[PDB]
Design a protein around this ligand. Structure first.
Ligand SMILES: [Zn+2]
Ligand SMILES: [Zn+2]
Ligand SMILES: [Zn+2]
Ligand SMILES: [Zn+2]
Lengths: 125, 29
């Protein structure tokens, strides 16, 4: 970076170069890459944070529920081949959002919570 | 066919593995 040796208790090593805590910054926004995430992105000769990397080079997808696009930086729920906007990952019956460890069934592209599988299938199929 | 809810993940986060570089924190004296 500043091309000067640090002389402190803690320093960083990235892209076969040594850096300060303050010197290893994202080339686009200037955020401290060490405090923000344990990894940096290296594209077109630039050291980039995840956000700027994904906004610029990320791959978008299609939501299995709403059929609208999902931008690369959007939070998602991956289930087998399918991908959902986090807000679309909800039970088709009760419209309830889930918790880690909860049980749901995947029918086609429908997410139906466990409690609801019976009544939903009874009504819909 | 009955599944368990996992953690969310970012959309393009699967795709940018090649471009990911690791930051090593080191010690002195
Ligand atoms: Zn420096
Ligand atoms: Zn950035
Ligand atoms: Zn959606
Ligand atoms: Zn439900």
């Amino acid at each position: 970076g500043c091309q000067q040796n640090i002389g402190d208790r803690y320093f960083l090593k990235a892209i076969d170069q040594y850096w300060h805590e303050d010197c290893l910054s994202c080339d686009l926004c200037g955020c401290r890459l060490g405090e923000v995430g344990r990894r940096l992105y290296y594209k077109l000769g630039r050291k980039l944070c995840r956000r700027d990397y994904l906004r610029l080079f990320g791959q978008d997808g299609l939501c299995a529920s709403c059929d609208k696009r999902i931008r690369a930086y959007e939070m998602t729920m991956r289930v087998k081949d399918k991908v959902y906007h986090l807000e679309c990952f909800k039970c088709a019956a009760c419209q309830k959002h889930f918790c880690v460890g909860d049980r749901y069934l995947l029918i086609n592209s429908d997410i139906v919570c466990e409690q609801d599988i019976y009544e939903w299938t009874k009504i819909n199929g | 066919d009955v599944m368990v809810v996992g953690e969310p993940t970012l959309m393009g986060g699967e795709f940018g593995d090649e471009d990911e570089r690791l930051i090593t924190r080191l010690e002195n004296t």
